[PDB]
Structure formats: C-alpha cells, structure tokens
Design an enzyme around this catalytic site. Structure first.
Site, PDB file in Angstrom:
ATOM      1  N   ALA E  59      41.102  42.081  33.650  1.00  0.00           N
ATOM      2  CA  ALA E  59      41.826  43.303  34.000  1.00  0.00           C
ATOM      3  C   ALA E  59      42.930  42.865  35.319  1.00  0.00           C
ATOM      4  O   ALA E  59      42.586  41.784  35.799  1.00  0.00           O
ATOM      5  CB  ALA E  59      40.936  44.214  34.927  1.00  0.00           C
ATOM      6  N   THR E  85      40.530  38.172  36.400  1.00  0.00           N
ATOM      7  CA  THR E  85      41.655  38.956  37.155  1.00  0.00           C
ATOM      8  C   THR E  85      42.905  38.425  36.692  1.00  0.00           C
ATOM      9  O   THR E  85      43.259  37.296  37.045  1.00  0.00           O
ATOM     10  CB  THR E  85      41.423  38.903  38.826  1.00  0.00           C
ATOM     11  OG1 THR E  85      40.155  39.724  39.018  1.00  0.00           O
ATOM     12  CG2 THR E  85      42.473  39.890  39.283  1.00  0.00           C
ATOM     13  N   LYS E  86      43.878  39.300  36.238  1.00  0.00           N
ATOM     14  CA  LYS E  86      45.211  38.937  35.776  1.00  0.00           C
ATOM     15  C   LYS E  86      46.144  39.248  36.923  1.00  0.00           C
ATOM     16  O   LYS E  86      46.124  40.311  37.571  1.00  0.00           O
ATOM     17  CB  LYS E  86      45.532  39.578  34.613  1.00  0.00           C
ATOM     18  CG  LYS E  86      44.355  39.940  33.588  1.00  0.00           C
ATOM     19  CD  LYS E  86      44.719  40.806  32.359  1.00  0.00           C
ATOM     20  CE  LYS E  86      45.983  40.081  31.325  1.00  0.00           C
ATOM     21  NZ  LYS E  86      46.265  40.983  30.489  1.00  0.00           N
ATOM     22  N   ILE E  87      46.833  38.082  36.941  1.00  0.00           N
ATOM     23  CA  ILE E  87      47.835  38.289  38.394  1.00  0.00           C
ATOM     24  C   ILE E  87      49.213  37.741  37.827  1.00  0.00           C
ATOM     25  O   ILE E  87      49.258  36.664  37.098  1.00  0.00           O
ATOM     26  CB  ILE E  87      47.406  37.342  39.406  1.00  0.00           C
ATOM     27  CG1 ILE E  87      46.020  37.834  40.005  1.00  0.00           C
ATOM     28  CG2 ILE E  87      48.414  37.175  40.611  1.00  0.00           C
ATOM     29  CD1 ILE E  87      45.391  37.033  41.006  1.00  0.00           C
TER      30      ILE E  87
END
Lengths: 222, 221, 222, 221, 221, 220, 221, 221, 221
Positions: E59, E85-87
C-alpha cells in the site's frame, strides 16, 4: 581446455612425417581410405601403432549394414587394437549397434553425419564422438558451418559426455570454422593440414629477417 | 594478468618508457637487433642492466633447421636464463617448439598470419603466440578478425597459452587486440607514446592551471 | 555489486541538501571546482569533511606537472585527509607518480581520461579508479558511450581490481549509459543529479492519485 | 566514380607511381612540403609538369587569419589556376571558405577530426572534406566510425561535396574509407605500395612459371 | 523466485483468481483504493481475510512530505505488520526510503518512469522498484527499453533489489517484463485473465473430446 | 540543410553568423526572457543584425487557440516572413490547422514523442521541433525518439521536416542530422564546440613548426 | 540431460523405434488413444509390457472441471503409479495443477500456445510444459519464437520445470526446439524416422562399401 | 500520405476530436454499433452529419453466409454510397470479397490475426486489410511482428492494397504500426487522446510562462 | 504480382478451394498424378474443366533422357497448348531445358534442393524454379535459408525467372517463402485450408454476434 587433432589418412609415410611436425593425438580411417592404401586392415593397424606409439588413438569403421554383424566387426577391431574407437554410420542399424556397444562399455564414434539432429541421436545413444562430414554437407548445397554450429550447440546444451570430431575437409577455412564453433576434436586430410603451415607470407618475412641480419652481421649466427 | 612489453632495441627509449609505463619487459626480433647494430649477447646484457631482474626478455632464433634452432635456444638461455625464445610457426619451428616444451623451456610461436597456424603452435606447447597484426592488415587481410579468432581458439581449447599481440602502426590496432582479450601485447615506441600524449589532455590540464592561478595566484596548495 | 555515487561539486549548501536526498558515498573535486569556490583547498577539505561526516570519501587533484611534485602534493593531501583519494592526470609524468604511489599502497585515481587505452594504462600502473571525461569526449567530436564501453570492457577482461569512476556530465543520458556499461562508480554534477529525480511525469501521476483520493474520501489521509 | 591521389611531395616517387597506378593528382600539406625542402612555387612547377594538365593539385594555406588565407589562396591560384586550396576547418577557416565559395574558388576543408566539424565546411561551400583518418585513430578515437558518419551526412544533406579521405598508416584504414563510400582518397607512398606488393601474389606467379617451364621449356607461347 | 501479484481492490475477483493462479499477494495504489470506495483500513482487513496469512500486501503513502510519509508508513504497519509500503521515487520519497531502510522497514519505490530514477531508489534501500510500464508507453516512451535498462542496472549493481513490474494494458507488456528478467510482477484482472483464456486452447480441447467420444462413446476412462 | 542559432545574444549571433553558414535564428519565451528585451525591440534588433536574407522563429504565449492566432498576427506584423512556433497540444493543433488554411507557416514545438510530432505535421506544420535534450533529461532516449519521428515524416509527410532543438552536447546534435533531420538549431556553446577541437589547433601548430623549421618564414 | 519420447499409440511402431532410438518413454493424448481404438487401461498395460519398467508414460485427463480432472489423475496413477498426468493449461487446468502439486503429484501442463500461459503452469508447479509447436505455426504464429520465449522464462524463473516440446510436422521444428534449450521432446513416428533416413547417408555408405569391395573382393576384414 | 480514422460511435467525442486531429473518417464494427444502442442506419446518418461529406465511413456485414454478406453490403451502399464494407477474412468472407471486387464495390478484409490470412484477402481484391493488433497481443502473439510481416507482403506483392491497423490499447502499438509502414490506422478515443496529453508538454509550457512573467510581468507581447 | 497455385489432383477440393482462394492454376507431379489413378491426359482435361480457360497447368516429364524428355514435352503441349513443363534439374534435365528454351517453350526446373542447382536452371532458361521446401527441412537442411539464397540469386542475376515455392507441411514454411520474395507458390490442400481457418477469427465473430443480438434481437440490419 582439451583439443584432439587427428590425421585422416592411411598413408604411413605422410603420417610419420606429419606426426613429427604436428601435435597429433592419432589417426582416423574409413573404408575408402583403407581401400586406397591397398593394405589389409589388420596389417595397416599394426603399421599405424608402430609409427604412432602406444599413447595415441585409432579410429576404424565397420563394414556391415546390419547391427549384429557391426557388433561382431567391432569385436574384431578391438581384438586387433584394444583401445580402438569403432566408427558406426548413424542410421537405424547403426543406432542399434551404438546402443548395445555402449551397454558393454565399448567406445564408439557415430559417423556419416549430415544433420544436427541425426548426430545428436547418436550422442544420446551413447557415442562419445560424433563426426559430421563437413565438406560433404557443403558439396550437397548445404551450409556446413551452420550444421556444425547447431550440432556443437546441442552437445553443449544436452550431452556434455560427447564431442564433435569434425571430419571431411577441402579447405582450411572449413576446419578453422569447426574448431571456432567449439568442436573439441577434428581430423584433417594431409593436404589441408599442410596448408595451415605453408603460408607464403611466413617465408617472405623470414627471408627479410635473414637479409637484415646478414647485412648487419655477415653470418646467420649469434 | 595483462603483460605489456616494449618492442624495441633502443636502450635510451627503453630506459625512459620503463620509468613511465607498467612494462613487464622487452621483445626483440632479428630485424630489431640488426637495426641496433649490436651483437645480440652484448645487447641482451645491456637490456638486463636497464630493465633489472624482475623483467622478461624475448629473442628470436635464426636458422631454418630445428636442430640449430634448438642449439640457438640453448645459447640464448645460457646468456639469459629466464629468456623466452621466439620461434617462427612453420614445419621446422613446430618441431623445435615440441622439443623445447618437452624440456620445460618456454617458447613463443611468432610470425603468425592466421588463427589456425597460431593455434597449432599453442597445441605444440608454446606459451605465447604472436600474430603479426599490422602485417596482416598490410597484405589485404583484417587483423582484427584474425586476432579475434586466435584468441577465441585459445579461450575455447588452450587455456595455458596466451596471445602476445605484436606489430603495430596505430594505437587502434593495439586497442582492438586487448579488447579481443589478448593477455599480452608488445608495442613499438611510437605507438606506446601515442597512448600517453593526447592534445585534449594537455588542453584540459592547461585550463585547470589557468583557473587555479586566477583564483589563488600560485600553482600550489 | 557496490555502486558508489559521488557528487562533483564544492557547493557546501547543495552537498548537504543532496546528501540528505541521494545515497552518496562522498564528493569529488578538481582544480576548477576548487578554484570556483574561492576557498583554499585545506579550508575546503575541512568543510567537506564536516558536512559529509566520517564515513564518506573525498577525491582531490594534484597541481604539478612534474612527477616528483605530484608525489609530494599527494603526501600533503594525505596529511590533511588520511583517507583521501588523490587524482592524477593520465599522462607521462602522471603515470610515473601513479606507479610509485601504487608501490607504496597509496590509492589513486587516474583522471582526464579521453581514450580507453590511456585509461587502461593507468589501471595497469595501479590506479584504483579511472575517470573518463565523458562529456568532454562528446564535446570533441567523439562518442563517449563507445569509449566508456571499451574502457569498462578492458577492466573486466584484464584489471578486476580497478573500476571506472565516470565523470563530466551534461545529461542524465550520458550518466545512465555509463552505469549501463557497467561502471561501478560515478560522480554527478548538481544539475544532472537533480534531473534524475525531477521528472514531470511523476508529479502528474501523484497529483492524479491525490485527486482521486480526495474525490472519494474528502481528506488526504487514511 | 573514384578519385585516387598521392599524398607526397617526392617527385621521383610520384613519377614512378603515376606510371603504375591510375592517379588523378597529388595532395600536399605544410609538413609534406616542409619535408621535401623545396620552396612551394618550385614544387608546384615540378608537380604540374610530372603530372600533366589532366590532373588536379591540392595545397594548404598557412595563415591563421582568414584575410591572409584568402590572399595565400590567390597566390596558389596564380601559380596553378586549377588548384584546390586546403583550409583547416576552424572559425577563421570557415570564414575563408564562405568568402572563396562566394568568389567561385574551389576549396577543401582539411584537418577534420569530427563528422560535425567536416559537415559545417561542406555547408560553407567546400567541395572536398578531408578527415585525418590516422590522427583520429592515433588520439583514442575510431576513424572507421567517424568516416562513416561524415560520409552519411554528405549523402543525406550535401550531394555537391565529397570526402577526400586522408592520413594513413595501413591499407586497412584506406580500404575502410572507400568501403564507407568515400568518393576520393589520397595515399602516402608506403600505403600505396602495400596494395600492390602482397607476397602471395609473387608466390602464385612463381608457381605458374615453374609449371609452364616444366611443360613447355620456356616462358613463351 | 518469481512473485506474482494482483493489482486490484476487487475482492470478488481476487478470491476467484487466487484459486486459479499462484499469486503471492495484492498490490494497491491510491486510485485503486479510491475507486473501490472502501476506506483503506477496511480494505486491508478484507484483503487479509480473503488471501490468508502467507501472502504479502502493498500500500502507498499519501503525503508529499517525507516526515508525513514516514508517519503514514507506521500507520500502515500497525494495521498490517508485514505490509510493504509504496513510496514515490522523488526527492522526498528518497529521503523517506533511506530513513525507513535504516530502521529496517521494507519499501517499494513506486511511480518509476526511468531507469536511473528507479536505480536511485534501490541504492537508497528499496527492496522493490515498480516502473509504470503502461504509463511509459502512454507518454510516447518505450516501456520495453526502459524495463530492460532498469533490470540491467539491478543485475549489475543491486543484487538485493528486484523489479516489481506494474501498470499493464496488454499481456505483451507483462510478458516482455518477465522476459527482461523482472523477478516480480503485479497484474490487473483483465490482463491476468487474458493469459489463461486462449480460443485456440478451447478449440483443441473440443477436438480432443470429439475424437475420444467418437472412439469410446463418452468422455470417461 | 538549414542551420539556425538558438539564442537572443546579438553579440554572439553577429560573431557566429560571420563564421557559420546559418539560415537564421530561433527564439522561445525563455530565450527572450533571459535577454530582458521586449520582444518587438529584440526582433527588430535581430532583423538588423541578420539582414533581410535570413529566417526568424518565435513562439506564441497563449494557451487558447484564438489568442494564439492573434499573437501570430502580431508576430507577422513585426516580421512578415516569421515562422510561428506553436506548442503541440490540443489547442495548438487547432491553431496550426487554422493558420495553415490562411497560408501562414508554423512550427510545431515542445515535441516529446514521435506520434505527437507527427500529428502536428499532418495538421499542416512545416517544421516539427522535438526537444532533444529534454527527452534525455526526463529518462528518455532522444536518439530513438528523433529516429522514429524522422521515419514517420519520410514515410508520410514529404512537405514537413524536423527542426531538431534543445541541446547540451554536440553528440546530441550530430545524432539528429545523422537521423536525417533537415534542419537544426544550436545554442551558442554547442555551436562553438563543433569548431573548437584542441586536436585541430595542435595539428596546425605542428604544421607551422615543420614549415618554419624548413623555410624560416610562415609564408609562400 | 535430455529426454526423448515417442508421441504415438501404435504398439508396432513403438517396439520397432524403441530398439533404434534412445527413447525415455511414450506420450499420449486423447486423439492418439482414440486412433488406436484401445481402451486406455488396456493400452497402458500394453505400453508397460512393450517398454519395460524403466521408461516413463504420459497421459491426459479428459474432463473440464478441476475436480473431475483430479479424479481422472488418480485413476491413471492407480494403473501406472509412476505416470505423469497431462492437464490443459486453462482456468480449470491450473486449479488441478495447484492441487496435485501440493500433494506431490507430478504433472505436465499441455495445450500451450503462448509463453505466458505456459509460464503460469510452471509457477503453479507443473514439472513439464508442452507447447503445441506445430499448432502455433498452423494458426499464423511463429513457434520458434514462442518456444524461445517459454524456455527463456523457465531458465530465468523456474529451474525445477522444463519444456516438453510436442506437435511436429517437420524435423526442422523439432531441431529448433532442442536448439532453443528444451530439455525434453516427444516425436511422432514420421518425424522421428526422418531424422535417421537421409539419402546422402545411404549414398556415402554405398560408396565406402563399393570402394572396399573393388579392392578386396569381400565385405569383410 | 496517411489516413487517420477514429474507431468509435461517440458523436460527442468524434466532433471534439475532428476539430483537433486531422481525421479522415470513422470505422465501426458490430460491437461498437451494438454498444451505441442506435440502429445502424440511424447511426450512419448521424455519422455523416457529424463528419460532413469529405470523410470516409466503414461498417461491417453480419452474416456468416457469403450470399447474405453481399446482400448486406448492398444495404450499406444504399444507405451510405461511398462506404467501405468490412468483411471478416474467412472462407465465406473470401467468396464475398471476390464477388464484390468483380462488381467494383470496395471492401476491407477484417478480423485478421495472421499475415497469410490478410494477404489472401488482398489478393482476393480487398483494398484495406485490418489486423486486430491488440487481439494478437492478447492471445499470446506478437502484434509488432505480424504487422511487419503483413506490410512486407503488400509491399512486395500487392501494393494497391493497404493495411488499416485496428484494435489498440496503447499508443506504442499504434506508433509501431505506422512505423512499420501501415498507410492507414483507426484509433479508439482514449489512445488518440494519449498522443496529445503528455504531462512533459504542460510542464515545459509552465516553465516558459514563469520565465516570461518574471522578466516582463504580463503573459503577453 | 503473385501467382497462387494448388498442388493436387483432387478435383473436388480444387473446385471448392478455387471458389474461396484466388487460384491461378494447378501444379502436378508424377506422384500426385499416380495417386489420382487417372492417366495424365484424362486428369489434364478434368483440370481444365474445373479451372476454366484462363488458368495455368504444370505437368512433369517422366524420362531420364533429354531427348525423350523433349518428346514428352511435345505430348503435353499438344494436349494443353499453354502448359508449363516440369523438368528435374540434373544433367539431362539441363540439356532438355536449354533446348526447349531455344524453341521458346516454357519450363519449370523442379526437384531443387540447393540454390546453386536452381540458379543453373534459371540461367539455362527455365522461367520457374521449384525448390522442394519441406524436403529440404526433411533432410536436415534449413529450407528458409535455401529459399532466401535462391530468391536473392534470381533478384541479382535472372530478372526473367521466378521461384515457384513448393512442397509444404506448415503455413509457416509457405509464409516464409512469400516473405522471402517468391512470386509464385503452390500449396497442398491441408496447408491452404489452414490459412483461412483460425479459431481466433471464429471466436471474435461469435462475440460480435452476441453483442449485436443482445442489443437488437436479430442478426440483421
């Protein structure tokens, strides 16, 4: 690592001469080569062993077209030369002979190969050496360079225990391309083997070396 | 394990280039020795003096007969015990190479104009194979193709030998040789100098010095 | 494995900003970069160490054109910064200095490399880093991509203890081609470094993400 | 078509090779003339007469200033009215080329080390563009690539201009130029002679002669 | 070690496709969540329920500021402890990635449009790099070239990171990604279904049945 | 081939126009901004320096097609043969179609992809300007994009040509004309790099040394 | 290693070719069994008696439901414990392969017309993947391309799986597959025989024998 | 020249895109019309009204029988006399295409999945050949290769026919078709708008305006 | 232009296929004729009847002797005045071909297995050259390469001859021949049918119908 260079001939005089000069591992024969020598095969094999010594490898071909007689002829050859490698044409009966001889632990060469798949089958059947007839492929409108590259690729991919013994040559370009494709062994006729070591450019530069040396020092000594 | 050699008998040039370049030694041939006008044994001792003892020398036999080539090899080894003897790759030369290999004496197969020719010398036992790169180009060949093929045969079949690329008129010929993977090369003086004297390099160094002097006045820290 | 990314500047403000963003291993300088900052080189080296911290690596270039004074200048730089890597132009005097410093175990970079053969000689002499001037090769009618590919190939074939530190860039395409050729280190000017991370396509897609999110949920929060 | 020139001021070698090769003229540059030691107008007089009026001559200006380059061009044209003047492709060179083109005087843009540089001279009006092939190779470049790019630019954009390939150490360099499509080329004496002195040719003629004499007794029909 | 993910929030399609395909989890992004209409913590709950416990979830943070991206990362980890975690890979994203890496928190660098940009995220410590394959094609680019360059950089320089290829309109794009060597991929529903629904397969299965039924009467052993 | 200079520096243009075989000068809003001169003062300055035998390019400002048209009229009134640069987007395409129908030549600018630029050519734009360096700066491969665009024009738009623009290196500019582009505009720094190779000065210095050593004068 | 199979139910042809060729077993499909007319459990018993205990058999499920495919797999394993079951790679096929893999049962994913489709079967756990080489050529595709892509995917991502190349009308198709790297292949009778029946082989063997007999008067040592 | 069509029945979008793009007309197929909800003669009237007379329309027959396809063609020509009738290239469509070519009625061979299939329709007399580009990619093929093959066949053997490339999900598919030489193409709305919505364009315009405004204050002349 | 022929004696199939395909005529050979059981003059009259008057027939001589080959050619022309006579390209066939060429009678050189062999027939005057494509693949060759070479030789050297590619087992072989540039080809029945029976085409036609019937109720306008 590992190259085996063979002479493809039954001329004892040429073998003796070229074995002194070239780093050769042995001699290959076929029925036409033996017939043109005029010597019975068992006498020829004795002369070959005498001239070559004991550390070298001989190859000789069966005559029969049925597998049971090919196997009996292999036994005759082995009796004459215990380490000899028996050449067997890659057709239906030959494949039967190769399979049985492999079961008995007798080394073979699958010969008269004109196509990559044909030769591959002989390797799968157990032949350690596979001999495409390079020049005959070219002589019949094919492309020997392509066929040999494909055959060698199949052994590299799938049969590490077998190798190509490239054979049948009219030019040094054919022979050179075979070993550039990765063939681990090759057998050269007398005329092609001599061509690798008789380039006129080499003589001319040696002549120029001697002339420059003599013009500076008189004699061709140190 | 790249080995860089100078292909010359010019002691003045060798002394100078050995301080500059990471050279492993010097190669000679009968024309190079002839041009120097010095007897070879005097030249060989001169070369040992300038180079020292960590370096490697190469010298060429003279005769066309294998028995006398071998006798000439023994003379060179007596004068220089670590020398590598250069032997032309022809019928008599191959006989010499096999005899000397039998005795553990290192050799170089020289005057190589084709990949198959050079490959036969490696199989006969020569540690080094020297194609005459520029001579191949001079006689309507393609030296880049020939060297590629010879190096390929050594990689495929003779891992104990190496190409000693020789005979050069341009740095492009020499660069293509080491790009093909040759593990040794011998440069004449003029080609060696060309690698280390580009006007673009001088120009950027001049600009550096001008910028430094404009900011700080003296070319010093 | 280990990529080393450096910044090619003396701008202390830009260094602390970009070191927070990018994974940098240190800072390279040259005489024009130091001259443009106006600071004495030992003052500058002090500020660089302070801004970068102890884990980073610094590169600084000798001034002299004589090998003896290049060697002494190397010792001056090492006295101020014991781990500094000294940059030495690859010309005749530069190769003398590199050879001696290599024997002494002092790490060097061979700089101002415009050709693959030239750079390869510095690696053979013992320089750990080889720095082609990528953009200057393009600026003088050459082809920097071809040259960097030849240089990296020479090191992979023959000098596995050296690496290319690609330098001198006007476009991210130049720098990208260098690391695609396999260069294990690179030093970027500020403008090229910023371009790698400021693509308008990324801003647009994030803006579209935020608009969809607020259209559905009203706030930009979970 | 193809224009083959000799790149030399050696009047003896020119006379000998113009009998042998199908040459269209001779190119010179300041070093070539300097090496001969002959004043320029003496040399041009000798070149005109040894070549005859069917051929073409090329000679280079000396000054770095465009207005003096133009005056030097007039000096050459007065001595040899059909001469093609060589002008180095730099800022002042380009000014001269544009002015001389406007005056209908043919020019060659010389000292070309990059394809974009040479292209600008062709756009300025120079009929001939001379890359220094060997100097590109000598300074870490790739002359084959540079000539290919130059020739492609002229084929795409400047059909009234052609490459005059120049500066050679090997026949391989010269052959790559004409294989790239270069419509003219100038060879130094040693490269020109290499094209016609391959020892394999001598060897096969010797063999033909032995075979004929064995069969028929003399080398006659 | 290939990892196949689904790129969707459609829970009905996820459990259906999860029974057919060997999926390793589900990737989301802010538009996929927004179109679902479901708050993210409810969505994440339903995903764990459908997929089970041995699967992986991705996400994306919402904020443009690195400090708030980090706060959002902790919020996601508290809801789903194993989540990745998508950054986005931009200046602030790179700051976030470096900090989270130092804390041992796994990240995916997302919205990658160029190979250099993606490579910087891997250097900064992101385990996964997600080029937007179809968006590259959509903006006049060539996604096949960009993905090959990104995978090459990771093979050369960052063995610990992998490409998670994302954003697809055709199976051809997805297939080219895994042929390039990408070790993970996330497929939308329509593209995933196309891989397993060839009319040629149904036609050959039908002919198999007709032959068997003509021989033996029914479709049984 | 048409070679233009991409700048507003009147001193530089006058110098390089004496040296290079240029066809004129291209500008864009940033180039005019950096000059600090109002556009009409600058254009009259350009026409005085270039002479009546060259060609100017200038870009519209508006984002609306109707106002782009009126801005073109302002440009033509100041410089009657001027080519107007119109960004290739939806509103730009509308303006190009309409200006083509009036017989007013246009350049479709700010081209980042081959399909985009091809559409401006089909809409009637004689010149198509890809932003070569910007494509490289944003993770692209400008050499690929320019090859594709030129191929499209060769296959389908004989009356249109690529005007290659936006450069940081001579390598970029050379690859464009090698791709077949029939026009190109160079910034001052790139243009000068083509004629300032240190190898050329070095060989002329050696020439002069050999000549002076042989003869004692640098003259015939 | 390489595995060569015969793709046929002709018992007479199998026993003849098993003596000649180095085969590892026999593959069947519904059409092949249907042509033979024998019930599959009878044919499986004959196939074991003719081949012996060391060979490997392959047979295909009939149903379209994963549940019934799985039942039919157990029927086949009951008759031939070591048999490998063939399952079409579609939605229901992948459900069966996933279940059978979790039970440690070996499977072959058959009716593969694309690389992506076959890759998913390997990811699901099928040991063998059988592209229908000739059917891809028959429907306007390029089987050589598809087989190359499929094999590249297994090399990159699924080292535990292998391609079993199937469906051939020419030896050129079969050879291209093994050149692509396929570790296994099954041949129909007519293609198999063409590999060992070249008229050039018979011609050269005849010449050998005629040379021998003309010299020695018997075909014996 | 190039013929650009829109593949839609959205009168609002057609009117909007015809003012922006240089379009030559509109193609439909049975699914596009069905999705309109409008009977086909009503839709055809609206398309003429929206497009005007200088445009070209394409509509497809319905039945599988060649006689009824010809009847359906007459109905379309009665409704729109310049229309081009689409015929699926199968056995019956080929009969229909040969008959309508004898009668001087222009046709488009559609639903082309392979180069050979498309070529036979051209030989039968169809002026346009429509490969289903995205459908070839969706079914495990390589649309780029098939289109290149189809264009090559028409170039070599049937230059009076042309490819009308159809069925797209990405601008990259479309661009590759026109790079391959296809002389006509029909685009769905969303792909067509992607060609003119690159965010890089908006960004560089914004920068231009910011530069202008900082220097002059107003965004005007 | 392109000449497409059918390689068969099956009158029913010819009548069916000539309705669908753009058929220019029929080729026969001694096996095809013998398989039909109809004496050649019976079959030729039956072929004329089914094809009609503007179609070309090809038939092959029988004898191994050039004189008798010529007499058989006269018998065929008497039966069918426009017939093209097939002659195997060996020594006696070349004699026949040269003589028939001198009389203005058209011939095809058949049984071609190598490019040089076929080229010799073209030089002797044969208008058509027929390589046996599948037989080349069958005997361990590469038919694609051989056809490419043969076509290239005709393009370079024999503008009055063309290749009539023959002997096929897959549409892939046939498509590669016309892609190589062959201007005529003859297909057996099964391969010709494969070009026009793709399952993908039927499936998209079915979707078009379902979409139409879902929205309108009947499959009509």
């Amino acid at each position: 690592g590992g190259m085996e260079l063979y002479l493809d001939t039954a001329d004892i005089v040429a073998i003796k001469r070229l074995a002194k000069v070239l780093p050769i591992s042995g001699v290959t024969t076929n029925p036409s080569i033996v017939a043109k020598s005029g010597k019975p095969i068992f006498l020829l094999l004795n002369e070959l062993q005498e001239v070559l010594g004991s550390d070298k490898l001989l190859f000789a071909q069966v005559l029969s077209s049925n597998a049971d007689e090919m196997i009996k002829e292999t036994y005759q050859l082995r009796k004459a030369v215990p380490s000899i490698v028996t050449k067997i044409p890659v057709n239906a009966q030959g494949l039967i002979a190769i399979k049985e001889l492999t079961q008995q632990g007798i080394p073979t060469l699958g010969t008269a190969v004109y196509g990559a798949g044909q030769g591959f089958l002989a390797a799968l059947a157990g032949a350690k050496y596979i001999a495409p007839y390079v020049n005959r492929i070219d002589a019949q409108g094919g492309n020997s360079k392509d066929t040999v590259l494909e055959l060698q690729k199949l052994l590299d991919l799938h049969c590490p225990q077998s190798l190509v013994l490239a054979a049948s040559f009219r030019t040094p370009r054919q022979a050179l391309d075979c070993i550039l494709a990765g063939c681990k062994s090759i057998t050269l006729p007398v005329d092609v083997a001599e061509l690798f070591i008789s380039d006129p450019a080499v003589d001319a530069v040696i002549t120029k070396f001697d002339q420059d040396w003599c013009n500076a020092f008189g004699t061709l000594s140190f």
